[PDB]
Each structure stands twice: as structure tokens, then as C-alpha cells.
């Protein structure tokens, strides 16, 4: 109103407490700006502690601050800019373009915090997204407007997997996309910037069918926390106001959990189990609940998750595990087998995988795959000690098919025409169902195992067999 002047009282960490002027109250989740020699430090009001002394969390570095110094109040949550002008620039957490494409020409601004749509608003249709990645398509098809979840290890081509998805699905998609990176390396960032300029999804002079919000780990933990909220609000504008479909991407959401855990500690809350914030459930919930397919629009989130030390029993992945619609696990073992995608075939479950939804044929084919692979794994121990010679004749044929199927999963990625230099492949959904059917029927039991490795469709399995035969 009349800028509430505050004097810092304590610079502790990210927590900086301000002592706003008496008889003029600030409010929960407000935004304070402190004029600083470098920009405006933004402090988000996070508690009131009385005597008009608030305890606020920093969103920018707190070095050099002098205890006491005027703090203006800009009020309400940090308000980012939203628009169709936001497409085509990298925008940091405090809503400033960090790619220096000049100040975004704001139409509207919106607060970082927003309320999840009501039960009445939320109505979600089951539609089937096509990934093109064979393993994904057959064994856990993705669903339009879904909440796809890339549970996996640390950067185990985690970035790469997302990159393949952007390369295929995003370019294909008519909707906008928002690439939001929470606490990720600037090497990865610079590569993404360059690559998405290269793939032309960003055309600097041209149009950009994507916006970027790059939040990097070289930002205070507090700032790291509200990267997610910022990106989401851009998506809300797309979903609602622009009324278009979207295809949200957030990376890596363990960084979102981790960030919140840290500032929880700073907020003085007694640490919860395995040091996670005691508000973890509701905070995760606010993020996930905000993302939904309303009547207004549809947003297809793909959220990366890093499973610390590949223990999904760890509370942070486990809490996320419920909240995401179409789980996919990328496992160390499969990566190590040299199978890239690293997707764990018997540990991939999707909401839409129901027989009616994906069609009876798709279901039946995939059911046969699941049994075959699970059999192969159960028999693997037996092969290990006893050998393969002590197994049933039927079992021996099943093992042979399973090894073939195991490397039939392999597909070279379009974005690994750098990593492996092998031309990528997009295999039609129907074609994959057909091709897997043939294998299961054993109409390619005259094909050697390596002629299934990094192939595409049925045509490719045959072609690579002929090539190898020579």
C-alpha cells in the first residue's frame, strides 16, 4: 500500500527475518523485495512471529546483507509473468529472463501459489499417448493428459530419456510445452539450450513452441524450492487462458523434495523421517494436484524423479510413487545389460494398461510378454547354479525367446545419434503390437539374439538378421 518498510533482524541462512513497521501487517506467502546492489533480493513471507516480525525465506543470495535495511513489501506471492510472450525465453525463478532476450512483454502476471482445481472442475478423460519408444508403448503405454513419471537413478541417461521424449513427442505435439528444470547442472542446461535451439523448438528469431524455466542448483535452497511453482503457473496460463493443451516437463523432482527438506530444517520444524520435511506429503500434493486435466485444458506432465541410491523404499520416491499416474522405472541393471532404454520391463505399471483401454489384442500380447520375462527371471537363478541343461524343454524355448525379447526391447534413440551415433527409430504403436506378436508366436525363432539388438520394427529384425548372416 504505502510500502511497509522492514529492517532485517537476523540473517541466519535462507531464513532472513524482517521486522516490518508496527501497525501495518504483512501477510502469509507475500513477496518482499529488498533493494540490493545486485537486483532486488526476493524474500517470501513464510511465518509471522509477532511484533510485526516475520520470518521469510530467501530466493536469492544473502551474502553481504546488513542487519537492518529497508525492505519494501510488494505483497502477495511472487508474481511471475505469463503470456504467449513467455514462450521463447529462459526465465529464472524470480521471473526475469536470464537469456537476455530483453524484458518479457507481460500481458498478465500470476502468483506462484495457486489453488488446485476443485473435484468438480477436475474431469479426466482416458486417452492414450503414443511414445514411439517400443518398450514404453508395449509394456506401459502413456496416456494423454497423464501424469507420466520417469522414476529412475541419477542421470542414468535420465536427461537423455526426457530428451528423447521431447524430440519425439514434443515436436509431434500441437500443444505448447514447458521445460522446467529444478536444480540441475548448467552443463545440462547449456546443452538443452543449444539442443532445443538446434531442434528448432526454440527458434530465436522464429517462433518457439516451448518456454524454459531453468532453475539450477547454484541457487539458494529456498530459490530451488519455488522453481516448481513458477513453472506450473506458466502451464496454468497455457491450460486455462490460452486454452491449449500442454505437455509439461519438470526435472528432477527429487531436487524439489530435497530443497523443501532443507528449508524445512531452516524453518525450524522438527525433521521428519529420513530427514524429510514433515510437510512433504502436502507439499508434493500441492504440486501434483495443481497439475490436472480440467475442462479448460489438458496438461501432460512428465516428471523426472531420482531415486536416491535406487531405493524406492526411501520416503521421497515412495511419496511421489503414489502421486504419479503412469510410473516407469529405469533400472541400473538394464542399463548395465547394455539395453538402452533402461526401462525395467517387469517394473513398469501404467494406469492405462487395462485390457479394454489399450484394446484386447494389445493387452494379450503384452500379457504374454510379461509372463515370459517373469519366467525368465525366475528361471535365471536356476540357470545360474544348475545350468540351462536341467530346465524343461518348454522352459528352454521360453528362455531362448526371452533373451531375444530382452534385446528386442532395445531401440536406438534419436537423441543418441550423438551418444551412440545410431539412427533413432519411431515405431508405430500398431506395428509394435504386431511385431511383438510375431516374436511371441516364435515366427522369428530362426533369428539370432543380436539381430534383435537395437532394431526397430519387424522389418528391421529381419533386415539385421540378414546383415548379420553375412
Amino acid at each position: 500500500s504505502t510500502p511497509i518498510t522492514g529492517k532485517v533482524t537476523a540473517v541466519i541462512g535462507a531464513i532472513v527475518d524482517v521486522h516490518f513497521e508496527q501497525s501495518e501487517l504483512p501477510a502469509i506467502l507475500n513477496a518482499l523485495e529488498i533493494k540490493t546492489p545486485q537486483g532486488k533480493l526476493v524474500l517470501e513471507v513464510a511465518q509471522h512471529l509477532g511484533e510485526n516480525t516475520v520470518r521469510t525465506i530467501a530466493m536469492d543470495g544473502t551474502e553481504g546483507l546488513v542487519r537492518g535495511e529497508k525492505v519494501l513489501d510488494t505483497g502477495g506471492p511472487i508474481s511471475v509473468p505469463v503470456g504467449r510472450e513467455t514462450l521463447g525465453r529462459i526465465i529464472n525463478v524470480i521471473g526475469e529472463p536470464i537469456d537476455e532476450r530483453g524484458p518479457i512483454k507481460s500481458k498478465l502476471r500470476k502468483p506462484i501459489h495457486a489453488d488446485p482445481p476443485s473435484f468438480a472442475e477436475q474431469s479426466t478423460s482416458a486417452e492414450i499417448l503414443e511414445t514411439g519408444i517400443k518398450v514404453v508403448d508395449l509394456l506401459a503405454p502413456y496416456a494423454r493428459g497423464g501424469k507420466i513419471g520417469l522414476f529412475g537413478g541419477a542421470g542414468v541417461g535420465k536427461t537423455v530419456f526426457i530428451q528423447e521424449l521431447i524430440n519425439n513427442i514434443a515436436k509431434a505435439h500441437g500443444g505448447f510445452s514447458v521445460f522446467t528444470g529444478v536444480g540441475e547442472r548448467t552443463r545440462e542446461g547449456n546443452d538443452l539450450y543449444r539442443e532445443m535451439k538446434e531442434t528448432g523448438v526454440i527458434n530465436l528469431e522464429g517462433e518457439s513452441k516451448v518456454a524454459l524455466v531453468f532453475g539450477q542448483m547454484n541457487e539458494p535452497p529456498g530459490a530451488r524450492a519455488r522453481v516448481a511453482l513458477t513453472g506450473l503457473t506458466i502451464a496454468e496460463y497455457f491450460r486455462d487462458e490460452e486454452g491449449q493443451d500442454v505437455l509439461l516437463f519438470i526435472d528432477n523432482i527429487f531436487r524439489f523434495t530435497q530443497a523443501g527438506s532443507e528449508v524445512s530444517a531452516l524453518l525450524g520444524r522438527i525433521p521428519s523421517a529420513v530427514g524429510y520435511q514433515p510437510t512433504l506429503a502436502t507439499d508434493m500434493g500441492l504440486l501434483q494436484e495443481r497439475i490436472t486435466t480440467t475442462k479448460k485444458g489438458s496438461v501432460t506432465s512428465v516428471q523426472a524423479v531420482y531415486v536416491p541410491a535406487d531405493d524406492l523404499t526411501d520416503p521421497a520416491p515412495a511419496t511421489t510413487f503414489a502421486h504419479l499416474d503412469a510410473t516407469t522405472v529405469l533400472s541400473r541393471g538394464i542399463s548395465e545389460l547394455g539395453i538402452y532404454p533402461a526401462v525395467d520391463p517387469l517394473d513398469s505399471k501404467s494406469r492405462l494398461l487395462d485390457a479394454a483401454v489399450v484394446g484386447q489384442e494389445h493387452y494379450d500380447v503384452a500379457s504374454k510378454v510379461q509372463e515370459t520375462l517373469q519366467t525368465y527371471k525366475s528361471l535365471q537363478d536356476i540357470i545360474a547354479i544348475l545350468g540351462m541343461d536341467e530346465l524343461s524343454e518348454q522352459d528352454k524355448l521360453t528362455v531362448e525367446r526371452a533373451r531375444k525379447i530382452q534385446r528386442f526391447l532395445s531401440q536406438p534413440f534419436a537423441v543418441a545419434e550423438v551418444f551412440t551415433g545410431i539412427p533413432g527409430k519411431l515405431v508405430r504403436l500398431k506395428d509394435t503390437v504386431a511385431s511383438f506378436k510375431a516374436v511371441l508366436e516364435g515366427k522369428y525363432d530362426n533369428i539370432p539374439e543380436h539381430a534383435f539388438y537395437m532394431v526397430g520394427g519387424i522389418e528391421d529384425v529381419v533386415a539385421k538378421a540378414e546383415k548379420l548372416a553375412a
Partner: protein, 53 residues
């Protein structure tokens, strides 16, 4: 004579294996039990330390 001796030996040997494995089950079971208790204690201590502050 040989084939019978082979299969007979295999039976005897694998039986002795089962015994050796059982002993190892018990030994690792004690380790498991100790380890489980220790985890509870170590986690609890961290919680106490936080609460104490």
C-alpha cells in the same frame, strides 16, 4: 556302477550342502536381527537430537 555312484554322491553332497546353508541362514539371521535393531536405534537417536534442540 559309475552312474549310480555319481547320482548317489550327488544326493549325499547336496544333502550336506543343505546343512551348511542352514547354518548360514542362522548366522545371517542373527546379523539381520542385530542390524534391524541397530537401524531403529540410530534413526531414533537422530530424531532425539533434533527434538532436544
Amino acid at each position: 556302477q559309475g552312474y549310480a555312484a555319481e547320482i548317489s554322491a550327488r544326493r549325499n553332497a547336496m544333502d550336506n550342502a543343505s546343512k551348511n546353508a542352514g547354518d548360514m541362514i542362522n548366522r545371517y539371521s542373527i546379523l539381520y536381527n542385530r542390524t534391524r535393531q541397530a537401524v531403529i536405534t540410530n534413526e531414533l537417536v537422530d530424531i532425539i537430537t533434533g527434538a532436544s534442540s
